[PDB]
Structures are given as structure tokens and as C-alpha cells.
Amino acid sequence: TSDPVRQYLHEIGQVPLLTLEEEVELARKVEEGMEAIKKLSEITGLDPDLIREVVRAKILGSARVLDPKTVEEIDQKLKSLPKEHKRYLHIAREGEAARQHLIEANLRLVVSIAKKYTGRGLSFLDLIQEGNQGLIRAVEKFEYKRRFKFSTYATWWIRQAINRAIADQARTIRIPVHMVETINKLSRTARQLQQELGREPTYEEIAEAMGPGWDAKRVEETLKIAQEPVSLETPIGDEKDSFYGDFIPDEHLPSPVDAA
Amino acid sequence: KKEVRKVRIALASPEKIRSWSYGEVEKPETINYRTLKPERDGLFDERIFGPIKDYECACGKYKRQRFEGKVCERCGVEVTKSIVRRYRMGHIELATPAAHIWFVKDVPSKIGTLLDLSATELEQVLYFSKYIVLDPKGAILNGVPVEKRQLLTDEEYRELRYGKQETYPLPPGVDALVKDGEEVVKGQELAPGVVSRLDGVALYRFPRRVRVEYVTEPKDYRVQPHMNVVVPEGARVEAGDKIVAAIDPEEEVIAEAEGVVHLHEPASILVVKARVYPFEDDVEVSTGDRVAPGDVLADGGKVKSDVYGRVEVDLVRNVVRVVESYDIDARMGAEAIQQLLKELDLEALEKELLEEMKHPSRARRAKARKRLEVVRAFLDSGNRPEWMILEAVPVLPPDLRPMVQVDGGRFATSDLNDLYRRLINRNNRLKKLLAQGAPEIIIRNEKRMLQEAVDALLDNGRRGAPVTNPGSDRPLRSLTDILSGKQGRFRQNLLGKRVDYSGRSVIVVGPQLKLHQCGLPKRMALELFKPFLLKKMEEKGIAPNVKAARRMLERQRDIKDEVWDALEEVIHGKVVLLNRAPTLHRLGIQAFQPVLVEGQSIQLHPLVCEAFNADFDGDQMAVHVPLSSFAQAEARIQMLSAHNLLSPASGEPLAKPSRDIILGLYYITQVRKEKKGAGLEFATPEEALAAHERGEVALNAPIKVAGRETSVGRLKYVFANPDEALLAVAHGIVDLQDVVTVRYMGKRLETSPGRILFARIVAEAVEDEKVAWELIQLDVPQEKNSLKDLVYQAFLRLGMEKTARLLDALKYYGFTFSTTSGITIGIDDAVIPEEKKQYLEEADRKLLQIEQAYEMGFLTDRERYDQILQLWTETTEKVTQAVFKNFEENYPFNPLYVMAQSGARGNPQQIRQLCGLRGLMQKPSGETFEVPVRSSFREGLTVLEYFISSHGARKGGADTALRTADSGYLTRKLVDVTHEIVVREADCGTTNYISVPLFQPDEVTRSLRLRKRADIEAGLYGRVLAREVEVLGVRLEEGRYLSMDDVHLLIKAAEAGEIQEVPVRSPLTCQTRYGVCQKCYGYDLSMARPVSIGEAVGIVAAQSIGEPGTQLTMRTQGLPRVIELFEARRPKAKAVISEIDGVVRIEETEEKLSVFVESEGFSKEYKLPKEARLLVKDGDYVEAGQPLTRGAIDPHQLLEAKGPEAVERYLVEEIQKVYRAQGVKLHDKHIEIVVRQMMKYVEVTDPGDSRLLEGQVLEKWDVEALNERLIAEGKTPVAWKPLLMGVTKSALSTKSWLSAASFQNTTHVLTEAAIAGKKDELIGLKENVILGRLIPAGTGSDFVRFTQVVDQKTLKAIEEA
DNA sequence: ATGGTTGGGTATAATGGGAGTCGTCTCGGATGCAG
DNA sequence: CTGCATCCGAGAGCTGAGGGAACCCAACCAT
Ligand SMILES: Nc1nc2c(ncn2[C@@H]2O[C@H](COP(=O)(O)CP(=O)(O)OP(=O)(O)O)[C@@H](O)[C@H]2O)c(=O)[nH]1
Ligand SMILES: [Mg+2]
Ligand SMILES: [Mg+2]
Ligand SMILES: [Mg+2]
Ligand SMILES: [Zn+2]
Ligand SMILES: [Zn+2]
Secondary structure, three states: OOOHHHHHHHHHHOOOOOOHHHHHHHHHHHHHHHHHHHHHHHHHOOOHHHHHHHHHHHHHOOOOOOOHHHHHHHHHHHHOOOOOOOHHHHHHHHHHHHHHHHHHHHHHHHHHHHOOOOOOOOOHHHHHHHHHHHHHHHHHHOOHHHOOOHHHHHHHHHHHHHHHHHHHHOOOOOOOHHHHHHHHHHHHHHHHHHHHHOOOOOHHHHHHHHOOOOOHHHHHHHHHHOOOOEEOOOEOOOOOOOEHHHHOOOOOOOOHHHHO | OOOOOOEEOOOOOHHHHHHHOOOEOOOOOOEOOOOOOEOOOOOOOHHHHOOOOOOOOOOOOOOOOOOOOOEOOOOOOEOOOHHHHHOOOEEEEEEEEEEOOHHHHOOOOHHHHHHOOOHHHHHHHHOOOOEEEOOOOOOEEOOEEOOOOOEEOHHHHHHHHOOOEEEEEOOOOOOOOOOOOOEEOOOOEEEOOEEOOOOEEEEEEEEEEEEEOEOOEOOEEEOOOOOEEOOOOOOOEOOOOEEEEOOOHHHOEEOOOOEOEEEEEEEEEEEEOEEEEEOOOOEOOOOOEEEOOOOEOEHHHOOEOOOOEEEEEEOOOOEEEEEEOOOOOEEOHHHHHHHHHHHOOHHHHHHHHHHHOOOOOHHHHHHHHHHHHHHHHHHHHOOOHHHHEEEEEEEOOHHHOOEEEOOOOOEEEOHHHHHHHHHHHHHHHHHHHHHOOOOHHHHHHHHHHHHHHHHHHHOOOOOOOOOEOOOOOOEOOOHHHHHOOOOOHHHHHHOOOOOOOEEEEEEEEOOOOOOOEEEEEHHHHHHHOHHHHHHHHHHOOOOOOHHHHHHHHHOHHHOOOHHHHHHHHHOOOOOEEEEOOOOOOHHHEEEEEEEEEOOOOEEEOHHHHHHHOOOOOOOEEEEEOOOOHHHHHHHHHOOEHHHOOEOOOOOOEOOOOOOHHHHHHHHHHOOOOOOOOOOOEEOOHHHHHHHHHHOOOOOOOOEEEOOEEEOHHHHHOEEOOHHHHHHHHHOOOOOOOOOEEEEEOOEEEEEOHHHHHHHHHHHHHHOOHHHHHHHOOOOOOOOHHHHHHHHHHHHHHHOHHHHHHHHHHHHHHHHHHHHHHOOOOOHHHOOOOOHHHHHHHHHHHHHHHHHHHHHOOOOOHHHHHHHHHHHHHHHHHHHHHHHHHHHHHHOOOOHHHHHHHHOOOOOHHHHHHHHOOOEOOEOOOOOEOOOOEOOOOOOOOOHHHHHHHHHHHHHHHHHHHHHHHHHHHHHHHHHHHHOOOEEEEOOOOOOOOEEEEOEEEOOOOOOEEEOOHHHHHHHHOOOEEOOOEEEOOEEEOOOOEOOHHHHHHHHHHHHOOOOOEEEEOOHHHOOOOOEEEHHHHOEEOOOOEEOOOOOOHHHHHHHHHHHHHOOOOOOOOOHHHHHHHHOOOOOOOEOOEOOOOEEEEEEEOOOOEEEEEEOOOOEEEEEEOOOOOOOOOOOOEEOOOOEOOOOEOOHHHHHHHOOHHHHHHHHHHHHHHHHHHHOOOOOHHHHHHHHHHHOOEEEEEEOOOOOOOOOOEEEHHHHHHHHHHHHHHOOOOOEEEEOOOOHHHHHHOOOOHHHHHHHOOHHHHHHHHHHHOOEEOOOOHHHHHHOOOOOOOHHHOOOOOOOOOOOHHHHHHHHHO
């Protein structure tokens, strides 16, 4: 019942893995479904993405909640098309189903990759979900014509999504991605300098070890903006009666003396 | 501005929440990392919540007032006060609905009760573990049709929604016994190692080779995973056509000639349950479409569907396959729960439950009633059930979840910000995933995470593992955590606050102070009265302006002399409040006039230390300053120390002489006894005088002259008046303790000069000689009890002002005479009697005997142990008696003896430990040792004896430590249950009363023995006589308040057999709503006069009960017994009582024992354990509710048997027993008030012509009013039974949701009140305190608070007008 | 017109987690046993 | 079919004082 990680693992494990034939088959289906989408777009003259959405809505079914009226009108706006040039629509439906299967089958690689990113400010399930987003992107961009295995192309996208989510969401005060990379590089450099020197390095040593464009003052500013806020509810003392925010005075509202 | 009169709480609709919000929070950003300004659309956005600066937009275009209500075009920030940042709310629009955990996890669940779903089913559906069916659409599961409100697992839903399509991996290089496209029954083997299990068609998957004929001869083509087969099985081919397409153009397989095609070595076989339809032209339904029987598929309608299923058009074989499925509509989570909630029709459900409530089954009726409670609450409040599912989540204003820069430049934030950030991140990710057409597993996981995030925001640490911040184990503080607990909003910021104009300091004895005065340090007073001092400095020439006065007062070295005189003028006539924690009763806060002193210590009067429970070993006290005229008047009239002289709990004096004062008065009022003469015989006084001059007889020896006892002092020294006797004392002729003859008040008194001096002290204090002579007891030494009686009599006869004068005089003279008396403690003052040695040897004798009796088989282990214990107990008692006999006979002025006898300090047990012996000690297991400590504290203990006593010392310390907490909790519960009870009217008009008995049955059932005087006083003093009483030719009229003299007269009449019980009014029989009346309460015990209308007697009762319990009552027995009685707990040592009347017939077998109660109608039986002890005998008569065994009686069984009155009397008597055992004086009224609140409710047995339900608990007053109206209309009255519940359950069942929520169980109270839409009418004190209003008690009572005052001149002018 | 910020991309193969906690008492739903 | 009977889980245990872990590349709004 509880422990949602076990529930999610059970639901992913209920889906069997894939062999080479099945994986290549599904990838080829996805590619031809996209080509069929574009062919049908050219035939009807309409926007390809909207017809893609109609195919996705029809596959997902009524169960999944663009409205039913519009998609129904375009659905019968496509059934009117004659044979020989109609196959495209069936191929698009099949390809979308293949995309769903492929994602469902490759969900476990996301967990395998994400299990080694815990302890960076994001919970395990959040990392898993962001890895799933990266997996969807990799599925969309995968090219089976190169005869590479799917996981080889999927791992890069999963890692990129997880890293981007960590850089974006780990801090209460959002710090841009380039600045986050700068902070990580600074910390790693400081750790290497401490390992070499046998003691905590000074800011000038870190500035020298970063390279051109770095002085001790800039390192000081970077460490200043990398400080994370503390909780107003941090317990002070042994008894559970004193919090940190109990020691912080209000400096905004005017005092009775000031008002007088 | 209209006055606030009621507060209502109710569920909030999504429309209401969206109307609250000033904008949607779309981003989890808080502030920018460079500029430390709020981020747009974030949790701190000025566009949503308001500007940080007053009258200034974000971009600075407008920075001035008059632009109120104007929104800047560039930045979107309104121009207004910044304080709106603590009022303006936001909201989050959830992608999917989420359930409010309060209505899910508070047992029993409101949503589960409404939808008839168990907790397990609700948890399974809400957190995406099982589906729930809506509109099954004619689906079949395992041969049984599916119905609404049915729970399907993931497997059952997947089978029903899609179908069965199993795949079997054919081993490499093995062909299958079956062909592609052939129906396969269950069990039919498809390979040498594969056996099918489901029915339907088999389909080849990835054939490893293709055999293509050529017009004939065959040929083989290998099929690798990286290539696919295009031509369907059993289809001819042409020259040049391709069959097995490959990725590489050179790898493609083009057919050389015309030939048939076959596919072999399939990688796997897919067995499905489906129907098949070939076609030869354009088809109509594409892949992923669901069809019904008889629908057009292809061939212009030539083929038609025969079954329900989903259509997939496989172009490889040019065949339409309908996989057996349904369009069933089963959903998961809060969306499904909300859909079920909106379809609910409450009136039809109410009718169904009313029909169900007619079942003979009691359990069914109880379940229907429980569901009906919720249904009717929703119907009455007008709330919609679907509002229990959230669509928009409100967002607290930022100023109540601040992100602030600490003085050190770092940032500090609230946990609510992190919870909101998690919620927003998960919602945004869910929206993105939905916009991407993600598979259903990912969407289900994301929705589960969103539900968990909402739960964590509302109530963290309730379902599952609590959310914590990384790197710590500390749970994040949710809104529920903020609301509830000892540190929550209610108990920490609403029922108690930190205040201005207050200080604290160590306390020092103030012996030169008057009763109404306290010593206040100069610096403390200057800080406390600073604005008044500034005004006074402005009035004088000390400062040109208030700012200059403040600057001058800022620095210590800048203060002069005249400011102190200005301060002395400021405080003239004003009072301050002194308070010592813990405040156990109202006397813990008292008003005093401050006298400015030097130093840093508060000076306290010695006579209020007992009321404060204050000593001078480091105690600290707090000082508060009442500001306005009303506050000062209340402090001076009601809370002045000199106006509070009697205890509100018992009516006995509370400010009284103690310690050194008692010692001095006793020393001067005790008389010498001498043995030199020892009853000699004399014929004439001259012979006695000559004998005394010769040295043969002492001055105070009891001699006999002329047949009358006297002494030489009485004959030798005869004084004309007290002045002559005291002048002789001043000359050393006689001592204060010598017995002489003095002429006073026209009489010749054989007394001592000290007693005459005490009489003069009293007479000069009260400024009345005859009354003072009447008050004092001349012929006894003045000790604690006599002094207390004198103070009480002086109060009654003269008033509190003269009583205060007398108290001050007694204090002064007691201190003066204690200083010069010569009281000291030396080691030789702990006199060891000689008898002890003998008493020890005697004991050492019998012990040997005991050992003999154990070596010869005559004694067991238990018998010998008990005999030794008894012997040592009796030896200890003998040693105590010997010690005190030695003190009485030989050293009557011994310091320890005088200290114990006067009541100044010490009790006989401690003195025995000092002098005689410590005695027996208890092991940590609770059993006694066999050897006692035979050494006293003067002799010195050995190491082993000291270690043995350490067990008891430690146990006593731990006892104290737990007891104080348990008593505090009990006192809080009592305050919560009685806080609304006020004296609200003069007379309720009732004719009911209670009968206080004067005789109690004996423990040996011999006869009725007269009760102790203290118990009768505690039960009778101050009460109003309900009926006229004639005793000893004295007529006590109806409506008379019983004074102490009347109580004594009643006791005297009872001792003469004229009366057996007294009928009096009581709170148990009062008819006043939310309180009592003046007559049913009686005296205000702190004033010895009828109670004033408006007195908060409930608080007084709770404090009176709770104060002694702290420490006084030891810890079935002690404080646990009192707690068990006030909570109405069923005893674990429960006794057996008779439910009906009848005669007793004990039926005993050698294996079992039983008691039959045989009435004239029926004969009942009671089986009890044989080892028990019976209070009844064969052939006896027992009434209903009488006990048959020893032990504590269950109050609920007594309520069923005898009724309400008997249970009230039992509870009162049993609670008073514990307090009497400890020696605590406490009036019955307070316990009666608490018990009256305990018995406040009834249960409906038959509704009659009412809308009530059977078994519905409701207030007794409300049902009586309902019955009165029903009788007025002429209907069938409601039938009810009384109920009894403990203080906790009675307090939690009140009408006011504010007090119940601030008491305990906050989430349950709040959710029930919100469901019901309850309105709080602000009747009690706690609600008005929470709202910061004027409490309906004391000066805030409607009886007195509209009084006007005017002079005669102004009144006449208005009269002329 | 410059820096700071943001969106997109990487191709051998990779396929179900991990810390933890056992020394408290009392009272009201509830599943299980019998009749 | 009812009833009682252990069984589990949920909500409590005085106040006051003092206590503080990848890197790179290119287009694009803001200032
Ligand atoms: N609210 C609390 N007050 C306490 C606590 N411990 C001590 N105190 C207070 O401090 C006081 C300490 O009392 P002592 O142990 O000195 C004994 P007391 O003066 O009452 O008696 P004698 O020794 O007979 O003179 C106690 O009466 C309370 O007023 C506690 O845990 N809670
Ligand atoms: Mg003391
Ligand atoms: Mg003390
Ligand atoms: Mg004389
Ligand atoms: Zn602006
Ligand atoms: Zn009354």
C-alpha cells in the first residue's frame, strides 16, 4: 500500500523487456509512423502536429480526457480520404502504439540510471520522472537506421534530463544552470586542492587553480551566493519548545515610539 | 464597524478559493539570486500578494500616496499599504483533483462514510492501487457481470479493457507444429516445448526463415532481426517483387520468379482471444477503435462485427482483427472519488438510511445512524460533498511564511515554502507529461506523487514516511503542525501571549512592608512606567519635549535626581501585578502598591508567601503594569492583596501567621511548669511565701493552699493593671512566662504577662477592647490553629481592613519576640530518650524467638516476614511515643518540640527520625527490608543504611516529578470542561435540592456513625437551605445562607438526634443555562458572603481542585484514583453490584461461588471469583445498586442501576475521600460543578415525534426544551436516558468549536465543525479570550457592565431638560 | 550593444531501492470467535 | 444473523527562565 517506490517498481516489472527483433521492429514502426504523419499532413494540407495529436488522442482512448468535438470532426475529415493514400493513417496509429510500447518497455533503464543520483536535493521518484521525460525525448529522436542499440542513445538523454532537473529544482532560490556548473566546478576544485595540500585551501589558491578570470574576491562572491537558506523551524536547545524564528525581530512595521 | 458576535467555519468550494486568490502561483521560484527581489509568478510575487514597500510599485514609477487602488502598467503592482502582504492569498490550479487528507484519514473517514467505502478501499483507490467502476457498459468478469462501485485490480482491468494476448518464445532453430493464423484452444501444444493456455488465434512473430518456391523448386532466405518480412504467409509472388526488406539496399530480398511463399521458424507465437475478418477493399475502422456487434468494418458493410472489442487492421495479412475487449469506464484516484461524490443525492440516501434504521439488529441501526450523522450534517450545512476534493489549493500570504535576511546576512525560510515548491514542481511536471501523451504508468506515478505532495503540505507525517529536508531527519512543519500542539497557534499565541510593560526579578523578604505594598527596584520601575515618566517630565521642566526626555533617559549616566521624584509622583496610588510561576490558583497573581527601593530585588510581604508558594532560595517573580482606569480599578478593588484574605477553595484564612511569627507568639504565650514544689501542702499563704523565700518551692510549682490549687507566683505578685505587670517584667522582677495575678477588664485573672501582652496587641490592632477580648483564647498558648481561628473570627466580626491591621500587628510582634526568644538548634537539642535502648533490646529479644518459631516448622516464610514487620512497626511507634513523652515531661521548651507543637515547622515523623530512629525501608520492588535502620540522624547512619534509604529517597523524587505533570494535565482538562460556568442570575427558580447526610454507615455495618466535623463543614458551610429546619427551638428559614455558627448548631442538633440530613441547594440541581445562580452556589468563600453575580465559578472550581493535587496528593489510590474518577474509567479492580432489589442467597460449591438476588418477581445470579471478599451475608437484604464485593464501583453500572443522583453522590464522596486522606480542605461545590458538567448529556432511546435518531447523544437541556415544545404542540415526547462521560469527552463534545479545537484533537474537531458548518456563539471564556474580546464574567458581565454613574447636579440639569 | 540567461545536444552497452528499529499509556473502530 | 473480545492505531503526558558529484554550443531577451 505505502512505499510508492515499491509500487512503481512492481508496475514497471509487470512489463516484460524486449529482444533485438522487437526493439528494432518498434523503432522502425515509430519512424514510419512519423513519416506517415508527414505524408498525411501533406495530403490534407493541414498542420502535422495537430493530426499527430488526433492520432494520440484516438490511441489513448476516451479514458484519457483540443476537445472530443474537434478531434471527432477531423477524424471523420480523414476517413473520407480514399484508399491507397489512406494506409498512412493506419501506419500513424500503429506507430503511435509502437511509441507507447517502446516507452513502457524501456522504463526500467530510467530507474537503473536514476538510482545513482540520490542525495542531491531531489527525491528518488522525482529523478525517475525526469528520467522518464528524457526517455520520451530519446524515443522521439531515436534513429534505428544506425544499427545502434536503443539504450546507447537513451542514456544520454536520461542523464541530460536528470542533470537539468537537479540544476533547476534543487534550491529554494533558483540559481541558473551555468552558475550551478560554476559552483560544482569550484567545489570539486577546492576538494582536489584540499586533497593535495592536506588542509582546507584558501580562496587565493582556489582562484589560482580555476584559471584566468578568477580572483579570491570572485570565489568569495560565488561562495556567498551558494549559501542555502536555513529553516525558521530549526530546533534550538534540547527541549521541543524553541525555534529559530522565535529569535528574529520584525524590522518592517513602525514601532510604537516611531508611530508616536 | 459592526460588532462580531459569531464565528462560522465551513468547507470552501473551488469557486470560493479562486475568489479568495489575487492570482495563480505558476512558478516555484521565491526570489532572485542576484537582486533578492521576488520572482514574477513566484511564491513572493508583488503582482499577486502586494508590494514590499508602502505606496510604491515594483518598478518605481509611483512612490507616493493618493494612488490607492491604482495598478502600475509596467510592473502590475498595486499602490497600497505593504501590510496587505500578510492578508492576500494565492492559489495553485491542480492538473488533477486531489483529496483533502483531513476527510480521508480522520477515523472514521467522512468520504468513506458517505460513499460506503472502507478505509482500505479508499486508500487503494485514492493512491492508484485499484480501479473503481463507473458505468460498466455490460462487461463480464469471470462469468459475473460487473456493477458500479466495484473494485478491479490492474490485472482485472487490463484483461477487461484490452484482452488476453499471450506470447511464447519458440526456442532458437525449432519450427512450430501449427501454422500462422490458426485458432488454438486452451491446452493445444504449439511447439515441442510450448503449450497454450488461452483460446484464440496464433500469430507468428519474426519467422527466422522464408521458403519461396519458383515455377517447381523451393528456396530459403534467412531472416535476421534487423530485417522484416513483408509478404503475408501463403501469398504468391511475382518476378522482381521484394519479400524480405532490409535496411541495406544490397541486403534486400527480391523474388527471382513466380512462386508461393511460406514462413518458418517463428521467433515467438502470439495467442490472442479475438475474431478475424478478411477484407478485399478499403476498410472503415482504423487501429485503436472500439466497435460493437453489427457495425460496418470494410467492404462497404459486407462484413459486420459480432462481438464487443477493439479493432486492429493488420495490413500485412490484409485482415481486420477484433480483440475481445470492452469500453468499460473505470477510473482511479481523487478524480474517481470526486465523480462518485458529485453523483450522490443526499435526500435519497437519507430516506434509504431512515428505512434501514428500522432493523431489529442493533449493529445495523448503529451503522445507519453513523452514516446519517454525516449525511444530515451535509444536508443542514449546505456544503457540497465534492468540496472535500480539492481542485484549487490555497496559498498562504508570504508574510506568514517569511523568507528573511538574518542579521548575519544569511537567509531564513519557512518549511511551508519548500512544501509549496514541491507541490508546484510536481503539478507542472504532471501538466507537461499530460501535454506529451505519456504512457499511463508514468501518468499514474505522477498523479500519486501529486496526491502525496498535497497530503504532505496539508498534514505531514500522517500517511507514510514524513517529508524531510535533505541532510536532516527533521520533518517539515505542515499547516496541521502549525495549528495543533503545545507549540501550536492556539496554545502558544492565542490562549497565552508575551506582553509589554512587564519585568522579572529575584524576590527578597520585605518584613517592613505593609500587607498591600511591595518593594520595586528603581531601575525596574523607571523602565516599566517610561511613558508616564516622559509625560511627567514634560509637565515639569526636566525636558523641553518628549524626545529630549527619552534621549536623556537613554544613557544611564545622563539621568539626574529630579527624574526620581517625578517617577515617585507618577506611581502615586497605582498598583502593579506580581506573579510567580506556576500559577496554580488565582492567588498566584496579586496586586500591590509599589514602594521604590534600591538594588535589583523585589521585596515581598511575608504573609503572601504561602499563597504564592514562594520562598527565598532563588525564586523569581514577574511584574506587570495595568494601564487604563478600568484595569487599575479592577486591580485595586478585586486583586489587592489586603482584600484577599480567605481561601476561595475552603473559606479558611490564607494570609495568616506562619513560621517565625507563630514561634514568637507561642513563645510569649506559653507558661512555665516547675517540679521543685510538686504538690506540697500549705495551711496559709504566708507559709508558702516563706517556703519560697527559703528556696524550697519554685515560683510556678503547683502547690495546694487552703484546699485550692495555686502557685507562689499567683499569691506573691498581684498587679493592679497590665501596665504594672509589664513594668515589673521590664525590671526583671518576673518573666513573660510566669503565672501571676493581674486585674484586667474588672476581673482578677490568673495568667501570665505574656498572654496579657498578646491580648493588648490584639486589642490595639483592632481598636476595640471588648471585641478583641471576645475573639482571643486567653488560657492556651497561641499556635497555628488558634491564630487561624482568631483571624477568621476577626474577619467575620470586623471586616478585611481591620483584619489586615491585625495581621500586620501580629507579624510585627511575632518577629520581634522570635528574635529575642533565644530559639536555636544544637546537636544536643535532638534529645534521645533512654527508653529507646530498652525498646531495642526488647525487640532484639522477640526477633530471636521468631527465628526459633521458624526453625521448628511453626512459621512459614510469609508469616515470619509479616511478624518481623509488625514487631518493627510497633517498636517504631513505641519509640515515637517515648520521644514525645520525654519532650513533654523534661524539655517542654525544647526547640524541636516547640517547633512541632506550635505548627511552625516539623511533624512527629521527622522529629522521630532526628531523635529516635529512621525505621523500616522499602526496596525498589516495593517490599520492606528485614533489618531496619536503628540509628537516628543524630547518631549517624552507616554506609549500608544510607544506601538502603537512598531507594526511598529516589522513589519519592521520581514520584514528585511525574505527579506534577499529571496534576497539570488534569487541571487543564478541568479548566477546559468547566470554563463556561458563570453565576448568571440571582435565582433559577428550581425546587430541587440535595440532602447532605450527617451520619455514614460504619465499615463493620454496625450502625450509622456521625461524620467528622471537617467533612460536614466542607459539605454544608455557605450553602442555601432548601427547606425550613427546626432544631433545638431554632427555626432556620428557607433561603438562609448557612454560616459556620449555623453549621455548628446543625452538628450539635445531629448529636442530639434531632436531625439526620440537611436539605440544601447545589449546582447539581441548578436550572441556569451555561452556568449557575446565586442561590444554588451559596457563599463566595473568599469573602464569607453570598457570591456576586458574574463570578466565573467554573475556573475557581477547576483551580481549587487542581492546586492541592500538585504535590499534595501522593502517587486506585492518590492522584491516579482522582484521575480515574474524573474520567469515569471502568476500574480494573471492579466490584460487583446488584442491578435490582432482592434478598441474598449465597450458593457455594467446593469449586465455585455465586450469589443469587431473589426479589418477589425475579431471581438474578452473579458469578464471582472465589478468592474475593463479600460485603453481604446469607439471608440479607440489598437494594438496587448496592455492592456485593470489595473494590471500586463502576460508575456506569451504578448509573444504570440506581440513577443519576446516586452516581453524582458517589463521585463527589469518592473524590473527597482522596483529598481528606491527605488533609486537604476543599468544598463540595467545586467537585459538584465538575460532576454537573460530567453528567451533561443524554442518549435518545425513542425519538417519538421528533427528527432525532435513536442512540443520538445530545445535551440534556436541549432535549428538555425540545420535549417542552413538543408537549406544547401536542406530539409524542422524546424518550432519553442519562449518560456519563469523563472530563475529556465532555469537553470535546461542547457546542463551541473554538474551545474544543484549542483544547485537544484539533484535526477531528475542525473537520467535524467544517462539515457541519458550525457557528460559535462565543458563550464561554476561552472563545472570547481567543478573539481578544471582553469575557462574559466579572466586570464584563451583562449584569453590571451597563451601569451608569452621575452626580446630583448633572442629574437635576437633565431632569429640568 | 553587452553579458547574463536559456534551450538543445552528445550514438559500444547499459534495464526493479535502501535505510532501519525495536525500554509508554489509554481509548475508540474493527475483524474474528463463538452462540 | 447477533453479540463480545482481543487487536491496531492514533493521540497524549505542568509552568516559568535560558537555549542559536558533466561539458559544450549557440540564439535571445534584460539591462
Ligand atoms: N511548575 C513547576 N514548578 C516547579 C518544579 N520544580 C520546582 N518547582 C517550583 O519550585 C519549588 C521548589 O520547592 P522546594 O523543593 O524548595 C520545597 P517547598 O518550599 O515547597 O517545601 P519545604 O521544603 O517543606 O519548605 C516548587 O514548590 C515549585 O514552586 C517543576 O517541575 N514545575
Ligand atoms: Mg521552601
Ligand atoms: Mg524556592
Ligand atoms: Mg505582692
Ligand atoms: Zn510600477
Ligand atoms: Zn440555581
